[PDB]
Design a protein around this ligand. Structure first.
Ligand SMILES: Cc1ncc(CO)c(C=O)c1O
Ligand SMILES: Cc1ncc(CO)c(C=O)c1O
Ligand SMILES: Cc1ncc(CO)c(C=O)c1O
Ligand SMILES: Cc1ncc(CO)c(C=O)c1O
Ligand SMILES: Cc1ncc(CO)c(C=O)c1O
Ligand SMILES: Cc1ncc(CO)c(C=O)c1O
Ligand SMILES: [Cl-]
Ligand SMILES: [Cl-]
Ligand SMILES: [Cl-]
Ligand SMILES: [Cl-]
Lengths: 286, 290, 290, 289, 287, 290
């Protein structure tokens, strides 16, 4: 038996976002990914244009059959949703498919660089605020964090402010809260990730020398690796390390020739480096 | 100076939630072999069609919209690999896509997904067979199972054809276009737990055979697994006999991994448990038919 | 349709019987990494020149004869990788070889083999140094050790340069031709059991450093092992920092394999003992100097 | 305790193009875990089955290398000879074997002289005459069928019986080598196939294996063969196990060349199959009782 | 996260490669945990002229009692060389008490070879072994053991039809699957053969192999070990015959070409990694 | 000519029916690594002693009978590897066995099996500890856990030693005999779910450390798995740091294979699921304390 993950994400043909990242990563990590597609696109929405087909009306039809099949899922991992209407459907899906040992992961995909993704609006943000209440683990980037808390984007927070924000989000329900893409004061070529585990009341941080917002889909890569790592039995900080190192390699793999960063990290090139432990701890308790 | 990029494969297959078929097999296998899979989805299903029931959304109308964007982006594919299509109307779309995106060094692979166990898949009819006969004329490599071979040739299904009769069929299909033709799921003489594969390569005029101690028809999607491995193996520069070896070894490990406990075979081979074996040394399996 | 051949590397190095230097390192490493190595031998020796004595046969006058046959065969190289040369006359022969055999996608790698530990290798003098200064202008990637760096820049050897000064040396050398410059065997302040490697890529204008707990100068031919892994890794499409990690980790393993018994370090790293680890997942240690 | 990296002195030429001699011996034996220490016999641009080649005879340098090796006190676990640069090298290489063999050394001689019933380019009966001496100093010899007849001093015969083949093996073994292996034996009525025959004086056993390739089509196939045999033996494998590893590795390398325009003069695609050397093998060799 | 467990009811012998020192490495290598119920401790196998011997008859019920306290469950029970005739009742009760509906019960009815009982065995061990085999699903007598089990005189030359009969006569006693090893091959003194019957589908199989297993002590233990593992992995009976015979052939050939004391057994550890790969050329035949 | 046969290891451990300890771990591991394991059984037990109970048969009186037969056979062992002993009287038996069967090139490995979690194993007392102190003087490699270390040194258990203190413990034991001392199960400050291993080699004077994200004491028998891998790695000619890396990575894998479902940790690591990883390339983990 191979554990099954219901992945509630869009399918985009080009760019490395959503299902075309989730599927390869989590399959490589030993988990069967069962897609519940939210939308179909030619490519991600950080290109100038894209085709877009909303799958809101098909999703209950898929779920209906999954019930008929009596499929059990070990995890439900959500990301980019096709319409605000889908939060209700997904939230009911989690309600009806959760099990005592389910892992529920929500990447609250709303935007990056201080801005909502194309065509998203406050209806999506308000609904997503509900969706996170169903999850065990959430992975907002800094843009999403402030949309979720209904505050304005602020790039420069203290570590204590960041720990407050982590607690505020955990109070909405999730035991594990992870904030990605946090600027590093007076280090403009670095990013950091902050995490909180309610169980044991622990806070972590990792500094990593890349800028994920240059590469669409890095949140999907990050959260995919976090999901598989936790499901394999790694600790939260171990998971942070695996995810951040994997993304670092994927980003570095694009260096030294002309590259259109919109195509994403070079996933397939570095995919086999997931198959190893990180023999150097980079994480710290804060 | 030198560069050695990640190659892109356009994958023209459905997306199914449960079962291990189509994009949920093509994506993981080919990504693991080092290729970016770019999906051109043909349909969305709850699960594959050999379950008693399934949801279904035909993506025929969305396809040209995706393709027109890919033209805008100026994406170039090193290979196009087709399988399960959502309507007979898609054949013209996919044919035009192949025509407009193929490069001189492109690999075009068509798994002519029509049926298995001697019958068409749920809701497939002769119009889909008819159109599939045209699509395969566009491909460099085709991978019919035995049910599909007979539909392609417009002949009745026979489960006891001779070896030279099979070479005959391989040539007949090759003459319609494909340099490489592979026939999967050929029943065996006296061995009801075994199956076989036959192949022909117009380049060098060679014929191959492999014998397999498994019955792939018992596991929905094993043709998607087979052709994915074939496609990555050929793209890595392996010879046809090596590609046959890798595809059949992989499938064998995938099936044997289900043994030992109650298993619902409709869920497919245990892909994720054997996916890292794609890297390993491959035992020679195929042999030349002289 | 797909053609993806075994790439060929012309290896312009000596053949030494004992010790692990030059062709007896380049051939096994690059073959293991999937490349055919085609030797253009610069000299024949019984063993490397860091032993007290050695036989030596200069092959300068055979090299044009070999090049001439290669032209008649119409052989094409995907890369040209140079190292220890057998006389000062070879620099111009080799420069012409690169001129005539390079392609638009070629990778020209020159390890400017001149000396180590602050001294030239036995029988090298300033003529070899002055000529090598010319040859590096023709390369895409050069891999001097710290000694060779100061000989190339015509400045006195200095063991305590800053990161800032190493960045300036990298840039001065890149200004002479090479898009990628790697300086090996840099001492680490207050850490005498360690070595660092520094690199610059003019494309993207990035600087890298990696620190390792080994002393490469204790094991003759470690520059050949280093440069062979760098060449293979770049030809496989790895990024520069990934090449640096692969090369340094392989060498560390090769050094670690000699520990715990009486070993004559002049024999080199235990190459055969670690060769099958070239393939494996790597965790990154290289970091960007911003 | 220690279990070190064994060293093999490889007495072969260095050719730039084609997959023959040192450019085959070095990568195969290294991948199998042995340090190869070349004693080069000649330098060529390419193997001699191309229309032309450069050639530098290294006869005068070999004694200079051997002299340094004595001063270094280097010890070899094996000495593996193949293509030699002049008939004068037999004496040099024989004296090298005599002076560096230890009681447990493995001496392997591929008596490289020709193929397809003809001597290689510029070889003549002087090389054959001297090769007849060299084989008597070896523990293992690997002639192809052409070389077999030159060594025995009989006319080439394409169609011998298995019993005649057992006779030839025994006749060669009686000249010195415990193990005699004849490659490239035609298979009656199967023109797409080849066979290998072998004898081991230790245990008095005879082996045959039949394979679906034609090694003569790929220059250097004897060098791949004997390299894998040498490695297999040095790892402790039995003779029939070595015959199987060698023939299977070659078939994989030839199979790697199919289905695209390939210049077979370039050899088997060594790099493409090199990582298969160490995997489990099913045996096809069988004993001729 | 589960590995199937096999109770191995065999002796522990220091030197030679018999019994637990073959069963443990082979089955572990095939993915199963081997849990020993040791029948005896010896310095070496009993085809050497001398050996130490400690009978564990009295210890085995103590071990079984503890296994019941631990609530251990076995996927297979695989018996071989036993330390006294008294052990047969102990082992029968053990199978009775630990068999589950999906259990695979394998008995190698270890009694002798080369037409002779092993040292110190007599007709009491034979008589009890005839009982023990009635409890098994798969049995693997050599030809010597076959005739002892049948209470008929050893005969080196039987037709294939007699052999089919011998196979039925044993299946009648209980076992679904009966395999006879070390059968001579008429006119081929350097070969051996293995004959098998499956009451299911009523199928008879033969495989000829060019080795003489009686020259190497423990080849029965190797053979039955590989059969057990191969059956538990889901191979057919004939596939299992091929794997086991091929593995032994390699182990035997691994000893050729130098001074070797055959009493040390096949070179198991040398060829062990060849179990990891399927036989590509089947060599069994339906008879 | 070349002969290169199967090396034999005398394994002086108990045979336990259930649990993964002693001979039922030494035999599969070393056999898989290419070695013949010849057991000298110390005791027969139903199961290891960390279960709620066990049957126990002391083989002290049988061991001389076995040894006398082995002398008669003229058997020679390449290594002797000792672990759990059945009574204090066995140390003299075993010491005499090592004296009489060691050859100049033998490897003598002693796992000084006494206890864990700061307690002696069931029915062990100070007589066992005192005799074990003698036995380790005869070994080349010893592998105490931290509890065993303090018993061997006759000091009270303590959880928080500095690295300087651990290096001193390593010298104290190594100087009494063993060229190689390895201390396992050392707690990691502030990391309660991690463990550490420390080692010293007299040949080269190097001190090593490795940190692992597992708790070996949760899985009875992990010391036998550890020492078995150390033993086989060294006998294959690996260096000490490569042995440490292989042993720790094997145990990590074996522990991680138990995650995700209800598991009875008393059964040990999932040995058979990871046994085939032993021949994979392994990551460097161990590093020098300078
Ligand atoms: C379709 C689509 N899916 C997912 C993402 C990021 O998770 C993006 C981010 O740009 C997107 O456009
Ligand atoms: C939806 C769907 N897609 C693909 C396949 C087989 O290629 C099947 C086979 O059952 C299917 O149902
Ligand atoms: C002949 C010869 N060749 C190569 C090297 C180092 O690349 C050395 C370094 O000593 C040498 O002496
Ligand atoms: C130079 C050279 N060396 C070796 C060989 C064959 O081992 C040949 C076969 O043609 C050759 O030409
Ligand atoms: C003790 C012991 N155990 C088992 C066997 C053969 O299964 C033999 C065969 O001789 C033996 O002596
Ligand atoms: C019998 C027996 N043998 C060995 C060990 C651990 O090495 C233990 C640890 O509990 C044990 O109880
Ligand atoms: Cl770079
Ligand atoms: Cl060390
Ligand atoms: Cl082909
Ligand atoms: Cl032999």
């Amino acid at each position: 038996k191979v554990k099954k993950i219901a992945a509630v994400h869009d399918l985009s043909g080009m760019g490395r976002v959503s299902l075309t990242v989730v599927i390869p990563i989590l399959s490589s990590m030993g988990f069967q990914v069962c897609p519940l597609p939210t939308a179909v696109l030619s490519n991600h929405t950080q290109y100038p244009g894209f085709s877009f087909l909303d799958l809101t009306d098909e999703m209950p039809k898929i779920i209906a059959e999954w019930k008929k099949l009596e499929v059990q899922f070990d995890a439900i991992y959500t990301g980019y949703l096709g319409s605000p209407r889908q939060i209700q459907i997904v939230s009911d899906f989690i309600k009806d498919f959760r099990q005592p040992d389910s892992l529920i992961v929500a990447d609250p995909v709303l935007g990056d660089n201080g801005r909502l993704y194309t065509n998203f609006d406050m209806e999506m943000v308000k609904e997503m605020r509900h969706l996170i209440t169903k999850a065990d683990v959430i992975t907002p980037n800094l843009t999403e964090l402030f949309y979720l808390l209904d505050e304005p984007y602020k790039a420069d927070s203290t570590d204590e402010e960041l720990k407050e924000y982590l607690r505020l989000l955990s109070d909405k329900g999730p035991q594990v809260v992870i904030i990605t893409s946090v600027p590093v004061h007076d280090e403009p070529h670095k990013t950091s990730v902050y995490a909180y585990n309610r169980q044991g009341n622990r806070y972590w941080k990792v500094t990593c020398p890349y800028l994920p917002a240059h590469y669409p889909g890095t949140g999907d890569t990050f959260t995919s690796v976090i999901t598989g790592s936790l499901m394999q039995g790694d600790s939260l900080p171990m998971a942070l390390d695996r995810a951040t190192q994997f993304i670092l390699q994927g980003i570095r793999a694009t260096f030294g020739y002309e590259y259109d960063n919109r195509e994403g990290i070079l996933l397939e090139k570095v995919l086999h480096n997931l198959d190893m432990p990180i023999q150097m701890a980079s994480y710290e308790l804060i």
